[PDB]
Amino acid sequence: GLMQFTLPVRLCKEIELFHFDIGPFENMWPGIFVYMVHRSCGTSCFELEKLCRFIMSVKKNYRRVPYHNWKHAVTVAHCMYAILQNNHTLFTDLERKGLLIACLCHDLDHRGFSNSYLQKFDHPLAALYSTSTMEQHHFSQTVSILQLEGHNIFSTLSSSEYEQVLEIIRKAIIATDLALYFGNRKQLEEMYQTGSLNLNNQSHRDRVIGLMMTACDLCSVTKLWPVTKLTANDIYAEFWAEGDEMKKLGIQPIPMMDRDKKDEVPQGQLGFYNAVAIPCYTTLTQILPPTEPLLKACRDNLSQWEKVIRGEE
Ligand SMILES: Cc1ccc(Nc2cncnc2)c(C(=O)Nc2ccn(C(C)C)n2)n1
Ligand SMILES: [Mg+2]
Ligand SMILES: [Zn+2]
């Protein structure tokens, strides 16, 4: 009850900033996550014994893949922490509780393959979930862990409150399907420009939370250039392996996933920042103005990619 979590001075200061990197020490990440939950939601919201057991089971169900791993989980959760800390008056206690958990669990059991690969392969998960295949599996995995003996971190909540927090987690995890982002951001853009956006309408809150999930999920493009540059090799390692599997199915992969087109990467990153990342952080800054450092850092990395093409690095 009086066992607060503390971080070394550099980490304690740096953790508040959007561009924070959690470092290479796996053992520190559960403590970093707990420190974030206590400052975001309170020392009281979770029973520490049940929380630690939940974290370790979540860790155990992340696989050893180059990008969609346990490190990504904590990175996404930190980004959500930074947003919640800079907009603390906007969210309910249940939302703060639910979103940090949703971020930690959003890629549970990811094997490094896209929904299209699962569909082309004819994987059993594609039969069970027609759309947002992986995302429905990720939420399904989250519910499984919560039902383990001594793992229910929402045990003190009422039946209706528990149903609400689980529904926030479900919608938030489903929102990490990038195919859904395009529509969501288009709809949110119009609501903001026509002044019809109201954060008291629950369906509008859902859409805003969905945008924050995409923003946190892509936050690797909003770090300092050395971090972003190195994390890009990790995502391409997954892309190229998926393309290799596409070729085994007798399908020519898209240039992005073809390891024989490694030279086309800087041009592909420009297309990504222009079509996906910049529009995402732009709309998010309009709806949540303290989230501007994300767009700032994203624009910086776009410029860095332009320098790469121009032979300046
Ligand atoms: C979903 C996702 C999350 C992160 C990503 N990149 C990343 C992460 N961390 C550091 N640097 C970069 C990417 C990504 O580059 N995807 C790409 C590449 C090409 N395209 C087309 C144009 C659509 N999309 N996608
Ligand atoms: Mg995902
Ligand atoms: Zn993710």
Side-chain angles (χ1 to χ4, degrees):
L2 298 160
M3 278 163 220
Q4 257 295 91
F5 276 68
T6 313
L7 297 183
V9 183
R10 186 197 62 90
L11 282 91
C12 182
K13 290 178 196 155
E14 245 102 310
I15 204 173
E16 304 304 323
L17 318 194
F18 286 96
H19 66 277
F20 179 67
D21 178 82
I22 62 172
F25 308 97
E26 274 219 322
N27 315 140
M28 302 209 66
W29 308 338
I32 288 168
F33 184 77
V34 167
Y35 171 92
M36 287 186 301
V37 168
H38 287 176
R39 283 191 110 259
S40 247
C41 201
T43 72
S44 62
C45 56
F46 298 109
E47 210 257 283
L48 193 55
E49 148 217 301
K50 275 172 169 285
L51 185 63
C52 287
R53 203 157 40 244
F54 179 75
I55 291 167
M56 302 309 303
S57 283
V58 168
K59 173 177 159 64
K60 193 192 302 113
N61 286 280
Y62 267 95
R63 303 165 146 273
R64 309 223 205 94
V65 292
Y67 177 76
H68 286 99
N69 55 38
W70 175 233
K71 191 166 185 183
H72 168 82
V74 185
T75 297
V76 175
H78 164 275
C79 191
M80 180 59 73
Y81 167 79
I83 292 174
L84 298 174
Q85 293 291 264
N86 287 255
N87 296 264
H88 73 105
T89 61
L90 280 90
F91 303 101
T92 81
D93 318 87
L94 276 192
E95 280 162 349
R96 288 193 255 92
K97 251 179 231 261
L99 295 172
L100 283 172
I101 292 305
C103 289
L104 205 69
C105 306
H106 88 288
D107 274 340
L108 268 168
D109 200 34
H110 208 283
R111 311 242 243 160
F113 304 112
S114 76
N115 284 333
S116 1
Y117 182 66
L118 278 249
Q119 172 242 129
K120 273 137 200 85
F121 182 85
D122 201 359
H123 188 279
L125 284 173
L128 176 53
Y129 316 113
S130 52
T131 68
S132 305
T133 308
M134 285 308 285
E135 291 77 23
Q136 297 207 74
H137 178 60
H138 297 323
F139 173 68
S140 170
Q141 292 291 285
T142 314
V143 174
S144 292
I145 300 185
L146 274 167
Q147 292 176 162
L148 256 32
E149 241 247 277
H151 284 62
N152 209 286
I153 57 169
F154 306 115
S155 70
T156 66
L157 261 56
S158 73
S159 304
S160 74
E161 279 178 292
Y162 180 93
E163 187 149 347
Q164 285 177 60
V165 80
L166 262 294
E167 200 58 16
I168 292 167
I169 296 169
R170 193 194 58 82
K171 293 172 188 164
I173 291 178
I174 300 302
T176 62
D177 178 9
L178 201 62
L180 302 176
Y181 150 79
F182 301 105
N184 192 58
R185 188 209 63 83
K186 281 159 213 167
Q187 290 282 149
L188 276 184
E189 193 59 32
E190 290 154 10
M191 292 177 180
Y192 166 82
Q193 264 129 21
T194 72
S196 47
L197 192 76
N198 174 40
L199 302 188
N200 302 317
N201 181 349
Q202 187 60 48
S203 80
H204 284 203
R205 274 186 99 83
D206 290 348
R207 291 205 167 272
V208 173
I209 289 166
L211 193 61
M212 299 161 59
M213 289 303 300
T214 308
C216 295
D217 192 16
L218 315 181
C219 81
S220 272
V221 309
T222 77
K223 304 294 176 181
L224 305 183
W225 173 250
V227 178
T228 296
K229 189 181 159 186
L230 282 172
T231 307
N233 311 330
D234 297 335
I235 198 159
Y236 275 97
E238 293 204 357
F239 289 158
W240 299 326
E242 182 177 323
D244 285 356
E245 293 297 330
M246 281 292 191
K247 298 172 178 180
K248 297 185 181 184
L249 285 182
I251 297 176
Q252 245 296 134
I254 72 170
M256 166 176 126
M257 306 195 175
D258 199 335
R259 63 168 78 250
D260 299 325
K261 305 171 185 141
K262 283 199 223 269
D263 50 286
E264 306 173 33
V265 163
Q267 194 59 59
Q269 280 305 287
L270 272 198
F272 180 68
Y273 279 73
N274 291 320
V276 190
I278 302 282
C280 169
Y281 293 109
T282 287
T283 307
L284 186 78
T285 310
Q286 299 174 158
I287 304 167
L288 303 176
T291 73
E292 197 153 47
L294 289 172
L295 178 54
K296 185 206 151 29
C298 181
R299 286 200 188 277
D300 292 322
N301 288 320
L302 170 53
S303 111
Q304 288 299 308
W305 278 112
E306 283 165 341
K307 295 187 185 168
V308 166
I309 305 150
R310 305 189 307 242
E312 319 177 55
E313 62 171 27

